[PDB]
Design a protein around this ligand. Structure first.
Ligand SMILES: C[C@@H]1CCN(C(=O)Nc2nc3c(s2)-c2nc(C(C)(C)C)ncc2CC3)[C@@H]1C(N)=O
Lengths: 1000, 240
């Protein structure tokens, strides 16, 4: 199973300096050997074989070299220790014992499978066991994608290999926003080309003025001129980001950032060969499970002339207090997405103490009318009819089943289903958004079921069979297609869209609106829909993504959506939306689908995608609802990712040492002073096993960042109750001074970081809309990565302090403005105030829209240069609706006098200023820029409903941004609404230009 | 016949509020409310159908909105009445006193649910840890039993031979190690037995946390709905 803790032994986080190890000799002898906790297996084996000579039957023992050790690990796995350089403390032993064996089996497969199992947090052999044919087919069938990717990587070696390892970190378009272009001097950029001259490794500087449009070779060309053959490559100073592809220099994110910030782009020229040599040739190998044996009258669904019928037999048990509840029943529903295909049918009520129904439930659905993605969503509910004629219905356990399997076979016969716990905050009687399949925990309520038998195996019809042919409105259609995904669509508009389904092709972007106008409980309408999507024009990737959410379960619809991504979705956007693309995988009816294959292909052809793909899946391996899907997927990634597996295992080992350390402080050292805890941190971090694991690995926040040696004098436990670890590392890059010397990260074990991760993602997407629309509203979407259950990394922003930190060490309402003055004296003052105002506006708009948690002096930080940003988002949307039942849209970021004084440069009447007038205009422009991209934000939130985030469980939870963005109003009405919210929150000050026409 | 006094008209209520009202209702359950002209929402086949009131499709015979609803009456109405039966109190002071009571009860009960939910999660996690640990003991015990078997297979011939050489020290050395091996297995088996005990107790402790939670969940929903009902009553009674 998955490892209970991150300890060195079971029930022991840390082994003592010296420990007794039970050694099981091959002659039946047992030797107790006192070992050092950090001793290697070579040392232990040598000490055991020397001591074994003092015990009977030593004559039966061969050379120590003939054997290896095997033991039971914390994963209940019998692991063979082929890497004898490993230390006893890093073996993850269940108990301190070692058994001496002769190496057998395929050594290299065993070594690879253990490396895979380590990365993935689960032993590979657990998959080999699984009875389910869908699972074993997925394991074999996905190998096609693995092959494809690896072959495509050795196509143009070593460039195609370098392109995989170090892909171009570029924007989606070379088109430079006019406000970025005006920072250029006649469409030209000043770059600094550094070179590491041999043999002393002296750093040479070369300032170059070149076209922003200059391809990387053209930059090399100019550097040569300032003393033909593209035998050199460009790299960013201070990190592992290369310019290997022919993209205009300005299209590369690093360069694009340098222009906008007025920063000097510092590049490094190196030999194409010095990088190509350091790249190892990656070799995928077909696993054992692909080279082995298995598998030791048919009707169409359309010929079954009968209604739908399902028998609910009995449930093993329920956990209910009989003195508080009256009766229990089975609620069921037939669903296509989150939409019932017919009315929900309940069984009769029976007593808590005897869950037995033996009842056929008849559904108002004709078996041939069942769509391909149809599901049986069910639950066992409790009913208490205590007060009045009022009865409270509460779900106890739920379960969902696909009515057809991966092979298109209609479900038949007796079926047992282990039910799942009701997710926190879910009050609905059914969970149609939850995963399909039985609960792997068999110590749960088990519901016995029975489907109809039709004397044969029923299969869903073939696609050939399904292809059965059996002016004022042009402007109405455009108006419906502009509307947001969650806009109300009337039965009239449905009937209208359905009637005009053929003219609909002229406006392809209406496809989600049209798909929701289809009666999915009618094989007549669906057959026709299927023909339309087959010959449907492609839509934009940001529109196609909606078709991958829980509203669109149909395989043809999802298939169509995946093809839009295959052809139109840039790696920049796949990286930007990967969080959502990984989440929608949970909505997939089956393990093998077009989405999972596309994402794996991409993760295996781009290492920047591969890194986050791995971490998003690895972080949810503790969650039994998706751990089998996510596990099999991660095994196939790890099997084909090449050398990146080695670097991933170094990241995973560093993180386990951090989890264990924080677990010790949180549990054993919980009632100990900061000095006592700090002394313990200091001595532990100094240990070689610790120093080896936490030095010289890639940053899980950004794999282009090398974490060299730890600066132990800068590492500390933070005052916050979760006891976060502040960690500092040296940047080992040759030119680190040109980027950063200190790579500081906060390690947090205790809080769930998924909502912060999402809020930070949205802020980045917002910041990018604004830049592209000509608005320089500088945001700080600091790195944040969830790596497991309530555990993650947070990127430290240097030279930045909280408002409370600034307020102390100096307080009045001018303390903040005074602090900024002291840090930005003379010429650089104005820029500090401009940056504060711009950043301040972006945060004001963004937080109002998202409904982030209330701001205070401790969760608002200001950089030394004036850049204001928010930290600790935690909550979002209508998080206060259940708790207080007030129908309002809060202004989390109310600009106090302290901020107003900064914006107004210390003026008396702060709102009547031109500074505040310009700040208002920034807010208005930002608000309308997001409101225009409303569909994106609605899709991104819709694609996270299955995530398990408390504040994002239904589409009704997304309604909040429909309110703050005032989507059911006109653009002019929405701006009036924003202005009123600001005025009501700030008690006046917010004005504009014109009322009737809203023209200057 | 009459207008705003009508039980099925609800005014400014949102789609979401209607979804809450029409939740798990029977085909024909309906209500009318302001759009964004009004919107009739009709419960049919497990879904809420939104039908726009311009008359649905033109020309009309609309007369007044009430004549349209009564023409199709669209079986059961969601009445404004009986919802307003929940708040008995006459004055603003008696209602505010009762809202403060319910809101205080709700916040306590919420904090109790949160505390109970954390113990549910912890117990559920701990149970999963012990299950993995028993699997590890099961695999460990098997290896130690294999050592006995392996010692038994070898020594059988050596002890038989050692008696021919009169070496009583060597036979005592062999069986001293077999005693060490057996005592260790008894120590491992006993340690698994005790873990099996804690798990049986914690599995029982989980059933009871689940039981307690299935009891507060319905009482927390009801109490919140009352808090919210008194809150709505106090907004409408107070100045607008
Ligand atoms: C004197 C130095 C200067 C820099 N610095 C910081 O603390 N920089 C930081 N950058 C961040 C921080 S802290 C952060 N913290 C938290 C927690 C809520 C978990 C605490 N969440 C998120 C973030 C992200 C950004 C020191 C200071 N100001 O005392």
């Amino acid at each position: 199973p998955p490892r209970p803790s991150s300890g060195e032994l079971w029930g022991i986080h840390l082994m003592p300096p010296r420990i007794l190890v039970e050694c099981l000799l091959p002659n039946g002898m047992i030797v107790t050997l006192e070992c050092l906790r950090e001793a290697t297996l070579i040392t232990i084996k040598h000490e055991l074989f020397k001591e074994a000579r003092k015990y009977p039957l030593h004559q039966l023992l061969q050379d120590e070299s003939s054997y290896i050790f095997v033991s039971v690990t914390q994963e209940a796995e019998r692991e063979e220790f082929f890497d004898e350089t490993r230390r006893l403390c890093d073996l993850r032993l269940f108990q301190p014992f070692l058994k001496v064996i002769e190496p057998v089996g395929n050594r290299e497969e065993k070594i690879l499978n253990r490396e895979i199992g380590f990365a993935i947090g689960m032993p590979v052999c657990e998959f080999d066991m699984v009875k389910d044919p869908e699972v074993q087919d997925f394991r074999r069938n996905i190998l096609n994608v693995c092959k494809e990717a690896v072959d495509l990587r050795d196509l143009n070696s070593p460039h195609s290999r370098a392109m995989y390892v170090y892909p171009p970190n570029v924007e989606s378009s070379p088109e430079l926003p006019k406000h970025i272009y005006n920072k250029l001097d006649k469409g030209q950029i000043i770059v600094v080309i550094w070179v590491i001259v041999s043999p002393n490794n002296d750093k040479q500087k070369y300032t170059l003025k070149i076209n922003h449009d200059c391809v990387p070779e053209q930059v090399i060309a100019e550097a040569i001129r300032k003393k033909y053959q593209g035998k050199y490559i460009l790299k960013v100073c201070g990190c592992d980001e290369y310019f290997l592809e022919k993209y205009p220099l300005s299209q590369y994110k690093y360069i694009r950032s340098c222009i906008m910030l007025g920063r000097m782009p510092n590049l490094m020229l190196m030999a194409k060969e010095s990088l190509y040599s350091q790249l190892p040739m990656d070799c995928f190998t077909m696993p054992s499970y692909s080279r082995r044996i298995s598998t030791a009258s048919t009707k169409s669904l359309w010929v079954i002339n009968s209604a739908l019928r399902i028998k609910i037999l009995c449930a093993t048990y329920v956990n209910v207090n009989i003195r508080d509840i009256d009766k229990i029943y089975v609620r069921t529903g037939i669903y296509h997405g989150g939409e019932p295909l017919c009315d929900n049918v309940n069984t009769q009520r029976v007593p808590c103490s005897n869950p037995r129904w033996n009842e056929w439930l008849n559904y108002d659905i004709y078996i041939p009318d069942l769509p391909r993605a149809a599901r049986l969503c069910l639950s066992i509910c409790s009913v208490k009819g205590r007060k009045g004629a009022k009865e409270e219905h509460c779900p106890l356990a739920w379960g969902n089943i696909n009515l057809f399997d991966y092979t298109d076979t209609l479900v038949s016969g007796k079926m047992a289903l282990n039910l799942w716990p009701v997710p926190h905050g879910l009050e609905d009687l059914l969970n149609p958004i939850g995963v399909t399949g039985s609960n792997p925990n068999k110590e749960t309520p088990c519901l016995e079921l029975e489907f109809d038998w039709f004397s044969s195996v029923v299969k869903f019809p073939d696609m050939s069979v399904i292809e059965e042919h059996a002016e004022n409105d042009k402007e109405q259609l455009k108006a419906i297609s502009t509307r947001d995904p969650l806009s109300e669509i009337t039965e009239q508009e449905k009937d209208f869209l359905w009637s005009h389904r053929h003219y609909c092709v002229t406006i392809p972007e209406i496809l989600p609106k049209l798909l929701l106008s289809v009666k999915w409980n009618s094989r007549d309408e669906v057959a026709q829909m299927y023909c339309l999507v087959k010959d449907w024009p492609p839509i934009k990737p940001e529109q196609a993504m909606e078709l991958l959410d829980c509203n669109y379960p149909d395989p043809m619809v999802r298939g169509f959506a995946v093809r839009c991504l295959e052809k139109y979705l840039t790696d920049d956007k796949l990286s930007q939306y990967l969080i959502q693309l990984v989440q929608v995988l949970k909505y997939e009816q089956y393990l093998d689908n077009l989405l999972v294959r596309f994402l794996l292909k991409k993760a295996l052809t781009n290492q920047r995608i591969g890194h986050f793909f791995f971490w998003h899946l690895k972080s949810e391996m503790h969650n039994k609802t998706v751990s089998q899907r996510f596990g099999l997927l991660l095994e196939s990634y790890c099997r084909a990712c090449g050398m990146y597996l080695k670097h991933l295992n170094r990241q995973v080992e560093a993180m386990e040492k951090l989890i264990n350390l924080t677990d010790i402080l949180k549990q054993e050292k919980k009632d100990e002073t900061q000095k006592v805890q700090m002394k313990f941190l200091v001595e532990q971090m100094r240990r070689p096993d610790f120093m080896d694991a936490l030095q010289g690995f890639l940053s899980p926040l950004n794999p282009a960042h090398q974490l060299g040696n730890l600066r132990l004098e800068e590492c500390r436990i933070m005052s916050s109750a979760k006891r976060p670890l502040w960690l500092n590392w040296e940047n080992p890059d040759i030119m680190s001074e040109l980027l950063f010397q200190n790579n500081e990260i906060i390690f947090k074990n205790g809080d769930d970081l998924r909502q912060d991760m999402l809020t930070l993602q949205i802020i980045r997407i917002m910041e990018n809309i604004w830049q592209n629309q000509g608005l320089d509203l500088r945001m700080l979407p600091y790195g944040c990565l969830s790596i497991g259950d309530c555990v993650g990394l947070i990127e430290v922003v240097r030279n930045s302090h909280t408002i409370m930190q600034i307020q102390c060490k100096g307080f009045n309402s001018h303390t903040l403005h005074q602090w900024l003055k002291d840090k930005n004296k003379g010429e650089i003052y104005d820029a500090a105030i401009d940056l504060f105002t711009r950043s301040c506006a972006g945060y004001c708009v963004a937080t109002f829209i998202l409904g982030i948690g209330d701001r205070h002096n401790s969760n608002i930080m200001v950089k030394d240069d004036g850049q204001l940003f928010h930290i600790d988002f935690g909550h979002f949307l209508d998080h206060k609706k259940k708790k207080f039942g007030y129908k309002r849209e809060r202004v989390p970021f109310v600009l106090t006098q302290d901020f107003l004084i900064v914006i107004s440069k210390g003026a008396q009447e702060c709102t009547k200023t031109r500074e505040f007038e310009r700040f208002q205009e920034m807010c208005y422009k930002a608000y309308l820029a997001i409101r225009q991209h409303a569909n994106l934000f609605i899709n991104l939130f819709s694609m996270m409903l299955g995530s398990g985030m408390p504040e994002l469980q239904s589409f009704d939870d997304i309604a909040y941004i429909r309110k703050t963005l005032a989507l059911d109003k006109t653009e002019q009405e929405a701006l009036e609404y924003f202005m009123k919210q600001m005025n009501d929150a700030h008690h006046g000050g917010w004005t504009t230009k014109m009322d009737w026409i809203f023209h200057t | 016949m009459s207008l705003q006094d009508a039980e099925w008209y609800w005014g400014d209520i949102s789609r979401e509020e209607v979804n809450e009202k029409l939740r798990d209702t029977a085909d024909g359950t309906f209500l009318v409310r302001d759009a964004s002209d009004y919107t009739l929402t009709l419960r049919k086949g497990g879904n809420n159908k939104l039908i726009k009131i311009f008359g649905f499709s033109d020309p009309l015979t609309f007369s007044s909105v009430v004549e349209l609803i009564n023409h199709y009456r669209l079986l059961y109405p969601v009445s404004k009445y009986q919802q307003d039966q929940v708040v008995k109190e006459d004055n603003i002071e008696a209602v505010g006193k009762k809202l403060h009571e319910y809101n205080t009860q709700f916040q306590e009960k919420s904090r109790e649910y949160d505390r109970l939910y954390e113990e549910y999660t912890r117990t559920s996690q701990e149970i999963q840890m012990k299950r993995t640990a028993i699997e590890a003991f099961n695999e460990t015990i098997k290896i130690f039993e294999e050592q006995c078997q392996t010692q038994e297979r070898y020594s059988k011939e050596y002890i038989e031979k050692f008696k021919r050489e009169g070496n009583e020290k060597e036979i005592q050395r062999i069986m001293h190690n077999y005693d060490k091996l057996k005592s260790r297995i008894s120590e491992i088996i006993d340690s698994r037995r005790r873990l099996e005990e804690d798990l049986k107790k914690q599995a029982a402790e989980y059933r009871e946390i689940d039981k307690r939670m299935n009891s507060i969940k319905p009482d927390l929903i009801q109490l919140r709905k009352t808090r919210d009902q008194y809150l709505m009553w106090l907004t409408q009674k107070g100045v607008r």
